[PDB]
Design a protein around this nucleic acid. Structure first.
Ligand code: CA
Ligand code: CA
Ligand code: CA
Ligand code: CA
Ligand code: CA
Ligand code: CA
Ligand code: CA
Ligand code: CA
Ligand code: CA
Ligand code: CA
Ligand code: CA
Ligand code: CA
Ligand code: CA
Ligand code: CA
Ligand code: CA
Ligand code: CA
Ligand code: CA
Ligand code: CA
Ligand code: CA
Ligand code: CA
Ligand code: CA
Ligand code: CA
Ligand code: CA
Ligand code: CA
Ligand code: CA
Ligand code: CA
Ligand code: CA
Ligand code: CA
Ligand code: CA
Ligand code: CA
Ligand code: CA
Ligand code: CA
Ligand code: CA
Ligand code: CA
Ligand code: CA
Ligand code: CA
Ligand code: CA
Ligand code: CA
Ligand code: CA
Ligand code: CA
Ligand code: CA
Lengths: 159, 158, 159, 158
RNA sequence: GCGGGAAUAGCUCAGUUGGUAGAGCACGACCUUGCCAAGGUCGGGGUCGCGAGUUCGAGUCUCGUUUCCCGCUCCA
RNA sequence: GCGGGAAUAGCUCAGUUGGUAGAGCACGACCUUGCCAAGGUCGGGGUCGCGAGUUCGAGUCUCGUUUCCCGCUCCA
RNA sequence: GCGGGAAUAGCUCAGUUGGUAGAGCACGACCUUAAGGUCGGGGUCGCGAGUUCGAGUCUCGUUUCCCGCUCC
RNA sequence: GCGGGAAUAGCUCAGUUGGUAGAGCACGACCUUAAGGUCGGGGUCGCGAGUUCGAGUCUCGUUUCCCGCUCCA
């Protein structure tokens, strides 16, 4: 049983029953996702359970900057300071749907959206802070490369 | 002039002059290189039926801390605040007064609205290079920071 | 099973019952071992089943020389031509005793004997002709190093 | 009169050695000790009664000779090549000629070769005679010249 | 932009010297009793990134070009 | 003997323009629900062979010295 | 491994159809003008067995050395 | 989210014990040297409802904007 294609979070999605195992991700979804969509703090995208409005996973994007000091030499080569980036702020899949490949589908939609964004505005890389080791390996397998200074911070270059 | 289009190796930037040399040399030296590195997106309007650039603006993702941000900008916001930086905006002196600067800024602001549908963006932010530049941006809605007086913001009505 | 320490082949040792899996080696023992010991073509040393004359393993030594062309530059540095060597001509273990580590013990006795001999007469290295590739790996594992020309010819320099 | 044979070392004084054959003497002085270290030869010297001045020496090294240069006596029922010990060097300082020192050196060498042939296959001792005096000397002590190379002689070991 | 390093088999690499193409893993087949695991062998796959040059001879030396990596430079 | 190269963690190795040390394997602990083989993580681990010298500052440059390697030379 | 030869005086060798072991050299001595010659001594025929009236000699076995070929 | 403020003429604002809607700037004509002066025009008091004899004013609901704090490992 798969799920729908990603769609912007709205006031109609039921997020109350969402649990990812990571308290920060779940609490963020339930408390601030929609409010931020209104506030311009982030853009959230959800996939729902087949033919429901119950969210099975989500990712959130926001513009960002990384200082040269906290960036790897590869990233900062011939770049302004700070370096322009897009922050993959949140990426979480309900535990009930782990293994069905929802995280990989979400990350794929996110990367595509970041490409489309980069056509219009300067973006050196996508940046994520992995919350767990499972998360780090997830991102490393899908092309991301950990930092040298902060080893749980990963980047993916776009061009 | 032409309608806005991405910078490419084909645009004539060698004779571009805006009165701020930093902007002109930025165009000529880094516009395209940054286009390649993903440090900025530059858009130019040209002298009709030429590849001669008459004006441009550059966009880049960014963030501003709550301390350098106005309270309207940081209201109920994470830290830092996600923004799009109007990194560069210049018009050749040959085209001053025709209202081209406002057209450039407008195209840029629209592009940021379209972007804000896909990614979190609280405001457009610019570092005004002169007092004229600061006044221009204030005339088009921007509001100076309280801390840094040449940093101005323009909020995006979602 | 358990065997005595190595001793010269003689007319008292039962070599008719030797089987090692290698037909050349077994036929060599049975046909030429004792006569060559008499003729000085080789010196053979055997280990027997403690309290038997049944040969469980043997090695045969004989002087030799190798030309600069088949010698590695390490071997030939500042050396006459040919190079003086001692030839590990034969080394085989009876099938009843494989796995008991007897081949390595024999090789150890042989190397010791060559050291004692090099005390009296110039010897640059021990040289052996590996009969199998497994044998080559055995000798490489115990310190031997293949030549550049023939990889089944291996040397061991003496201290 | 001299000491009993002993291995060459950095302590033996060989600069004053003269045997009449310059090749042998220069070999002693230039290569004896280095070859002792390299495993190219094992050298043994007899000294001048409580000195480190060498009066004579012989050098041994393993070797093999092909059947073509072997006498039929040497190759009878033998592999090819034939394993031998090479008496590479044997020389007496002229100051001790006639005293029978060469025979004593050869005898010590032959004994050492017996003791070696106990441990490793050795068909014969082989020497390359440099002069006719030398060839006849080796022939007098039992050696037998080759059929092909007339300056190469063999001595079989019982 | 300046400097340095890299590019050799599907992957990871070795190749000091200017002198016949390499190893481990992967793949096809075979060997060990008929399958076969471990060990071994055979085979496919390389204009040694590409191109030009010196030499009797180039992975090796020379030059041009492509790409990647690492340090520094830098646009608030 | 002439020439070239090397020595950096228990092992195999990187280390840039002279600006205060790193990787893989190995080791101790943890994850794998626990334990266990594989995999992943965290962590500890160096007079950069030795000595001297230059320098504000040495893994880096100079010299000496110990050891090893590669090419050539060479004693039928 | 196959094949062939040798063993007799200190040395080199002879010893036909089986009948006490021969010649030169060498060695000791002598003759005279170191040489040549003469004189003198030494075997038991590698070993063992057998045939024979009788064996250096023939039969068989064996020891040692040598030569050609074979060969890992 | 907690707290505070704003909305009345084109603009800046007043209209406190609740009574046809007020001043300045600005706008049109005119006086004179385009500033000053004179004259003239413009609302329906953010919206809706309620109390009141009567609501710009009081009560409640609501719309938009603004300020301070809070905040997203
Ligand atoms: Ca659930
Ligand atoms: Ca112009
Ligand atoms: Ca058996
Ligand atoms: Ca002298
Ligand atoms: Ca470069
Ligand atoms: Ca590759
Ligand atoms: Ca390489
Ligand atoms: Ca080569
Ligand atoms: Ca078969
Ligand atoms: Ca192949
Ligand atoms: Ca090809
Ligand atoms: Ca090429
Ligand atoms: Ca390639
Ligand atoms: Ca190619
Ligand atoms: Ca040519
Ligand atoms: Ca080549
Ligand atoms: Ca190049
Ligand atoms: Ca080491
Ligand atoms: Ca190194
Ligand atoms: Ca340092
Ligand atoms: Ca020092
Ligand atoms: Ca450094
Ligand atoms: Ca040095
Ligand atoms: Ca015979
Ligand atoms: Ca006799
Ligand atoms: Ca005789
Ligand atoms: Ca005869
Ligand atoms: Ca006479
Ligand atoms: Ca007589
Ligand atoms: Ca007798
Ligand atoms: Ca008779
Ligand atoms: Ca409020
Ligand atoms: Ca109004
Ligand atoms: Ca107003
Ligand atoms: Ca007011
Ligand atoms: Ca009223
Ligand atoms: Ca006016
Ligand atoms: Ca007035
Ligand atoms: Ca109204
Ligand atoms: Ca009423
Ligand atoms: Ca109210």
């Amino acid at each position: 049983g798969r799920v729908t294609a990603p769609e912007p979070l709205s006031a109609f999605h039921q997020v109350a029953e969402f649990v990812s195992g990571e308290a920060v991700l779940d609490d963020w979804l339930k408390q601030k996702g929609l409010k931020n969509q209104a506030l311009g703090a982030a853009r959230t995208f959800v996939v729902c359970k087949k033919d429901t409005k119950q969210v099975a996973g989500f990712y959130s994007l926001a513009t960002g900057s990384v200082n040269h000091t906290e960036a790897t030499g590869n990233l900062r080569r011939n770049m302004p300071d700070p370096i322009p980036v897009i922050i993959l702020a949140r990426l979480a899949v309900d535990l009930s749907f782990h293994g069905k490949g929802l995280g990989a589908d979400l990350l794929h939609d996110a990367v595509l959206r970041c490409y489309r964004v980069a056509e219009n505005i300067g973006v050196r890389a996508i940046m994520v802070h992995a919350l767990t080791e499972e998360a780090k390996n997830f991102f490393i397998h899908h092309g991301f490369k950990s930092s040298q200074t902060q080893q749980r911070t990963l980047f993916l270059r776009l061009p």
